[PDB]
Design a protein around this ligand. Structure first.
Ligand SMILES: [Ca+2]
Ligand SMILES: [Ca+2]
Lengths: 384, 387
């Protein structure tokens, strides 16, 4: 089976079957497929002035306009953006920035970066209530998971710690939506220590939560935000790091951004802004998606349905009260039914996930929900 | 000065003045500016199937064809390529691979990578660069080549082989001043590498995709590296992309994100196709580079020029105040020469008091003549002011 075209939220195989791409390529095709404007802007920039030269610049350098355009939608006080080739490059880049920052402040011992489960890096607990909450409520567990950050800081010693790094919501790990008490508690902990906050926005960035950034959805004011994916809606490779102004001022005592990529990202943000795609997500599309997605919680196979904005997860279990999982693996089986039925929904163990294009319509959401329920029924038949 | 269009080797500013881009953007615009084919393939890939999806493969995935295309021109035995977003990403990637390699072989202590000055970063140490003009002292070129290579063996023993993962080196150091090593350098390095347990990383970000007249600098000098970071010339700078080309034995071990974005890959595939089917690299080797290097030597007669050197489609000029002693001017001259270049419409980079070129590979013999005329003018104007 072979893909020959794509348009909106749909792929078409060579036969003529439409597949609803519920994962937006790789959490990235935010304006959907077939957006001619993006190809046209790339084409023109490539012919006109594809790249930099050592002496002189162009009329309206797209990278500069892009940086201003991102400065206008980023959290307040984050008006610098350093461009890269990719999201993984942005993650390497942020780790270097944080270490250089503290080194320039005269504290080169602050090297350790604290991340979350799922070589100068240590890990704390992820705020995954369903899998790791034990006997606690969501609210209590959110507090506890946040407190693991303070505990790790003290254990490693503040004077050895550079930064905490975290996605607002962990994507690839299973759309792990944290309790509402998680981020407020983390902010309290960050306020007490000398530690930079890296908010990894590679997935959540450019509209995915209904705000421009996951950080704005939860009310976080980070120091650095790696971005990619939604930056270009996956149409051309590009990454970046958005940086709080004070951090840059310190750093001021390769990242220009390729003009073709920058032209595409600028047009992509323009479309997201001028067609009110992120506004529509917040006001209409995401509330509708999350409401319909909850209906799947009734399904005999589903232990929990969760989500925020345009992401969601379903936990597939054998027993809803104990959260006991099936032997072997229901997720792989459910995925195969997804594959057969023409719905792209990723399996992460026994967790099913979606991340559709942000332009997905209410009828398209209905289709997604119908296909998902069908796949859950077929999986239950085989498993229950 | 503001650039409004570009074509072949030329930029045009808003007033219609032509600037000869002697640096090929940043050592990367190998097929020149204005190659419609590259924009067309990007456009079509972007509209049709811009990216991966989780379930089903695409008709003719450009990244797979690109990997085959690079396997066909890479040094022999290097038939795997891992894609990245950029050359600096490829350099991070390759340092991780060499450390993972030795870790999988059961020797996670081999972590240290030996590079060269002008090539703190934990896990990297540096040896001497084979820069005869600046650091050759009282040695001949041939003997200094040997000595600079021997510093690698000395560093290996000093660090201890059991702590060493790899040696990393460009065939010719580009950004450092087109430091062309003596002919005895690479053969001696190969002898040293053969005696130790050490991977050879040949950094081809600049030298790659035709710049020396071979596809890779490694082929120009007869090296057989284990890993080669690439970027730039991969797409001729039209779309960001990087990669790492890896020797098959290394991969077999490693087998005990790098897919390459389809739009970039379509452009790189078309770019290599053009370089191959128009015989651009062959023409460089047989015609263009010999002509460039011959004309570039003529500037050695200039009162300001202590040495002219180059290989393929790169070159350097050393600006000195006294040709007999190699004494340099009091804190300047490179930037002054660059300002004259800027004014006269030639892009030549200044690295200290070393002037450097790296033109597009499609540059013609009349264009080379123009470059040489402009360079000599810039040297005259610089001498007038400084000598
Ligand atoms: Ca702002
Ligand atoms: Ca052969």
């Amino acid at each position: 089976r072979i893909i020959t075209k794509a348009e909106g939220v749909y792929l078409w195989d060579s036969e003529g079957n439409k597949i609803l791409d519920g994962m937006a390529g790789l959490w990235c095709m935010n304006v959907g497929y077939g957006r001619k404007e993006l190809a046209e802007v790339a084409y023109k920039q490539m012919l006109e002035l594809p790249y930099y030269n050592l002496f002189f610049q162009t009329a309206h350098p797209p990278a500069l306009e892009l940086a201003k355009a991102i400065a206008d939608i980023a959290p307040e006080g984050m008006n610098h953006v350093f461009f890269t080739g990719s999201g993984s490059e942005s993650n390497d880049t942020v780790l270097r920035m944080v270490r250089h920052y503290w080194s320039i402040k005269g504290k080169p011992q602050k090297k350790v970066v604290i991340g979350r489960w799922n070589p100068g890096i240590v890990h704390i607990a992820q705020p995954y209530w369903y899998g790791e909450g034990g006997d606690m409520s969501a609210e209590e567990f959110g507090v506890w998971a946040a407190e693991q950050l303070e505990k790790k800081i003290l254990e490693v010693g503040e004077e050895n710690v550079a930064a905490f790094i975290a996605e607002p919501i962990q994507g690839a790990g299973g759309v792990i939506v944290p309790p509402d008490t998680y981020w407020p508690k983390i902010r309290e902990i960050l306020a007490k220590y000398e530690i930079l906050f890296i908010a990894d926005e590679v997935i959540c960035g450019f509209g995915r939560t209904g705000e421009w950034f996951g950080s704005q959805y939860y009310g976080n004011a980070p120091d650095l935000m790696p971005i990619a994916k939604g930056l270009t809606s996956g149409y051309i490779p590009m990454g970046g790091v958005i940086v709080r102004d004070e951090i840059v001022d310190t750093l001021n005592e390769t990242y220009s951004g390729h003009p073709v990529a920058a032209a595409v990202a600028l047009e992509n943000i323009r479309i997201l802004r001028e067609e009110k795609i992120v506004e529509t997500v917040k006001a209409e599309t995401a509330p509708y998606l999350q409401k319909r997605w909850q209906e799947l919680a009734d399904h005999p196979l589903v232990g929990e349905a969760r989500g925020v904005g345009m992401v969601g997860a379903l936990e597939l279990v054998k027993n809803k009260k104990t959260r006991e999982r099936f032997e072997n693996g229901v997720g792989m089986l459910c995925r195969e039914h997804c594959f057969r039925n023409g719905l792209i929904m990723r399996a992460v163990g026994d967790t099913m996930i979606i991340s559709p294009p942000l332009v997905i319509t209410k009828p398209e959401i209905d289709e997604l929900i119908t296909l998902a329920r069908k796949c859950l029924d077929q999986t239950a038949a085989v498993a229950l």
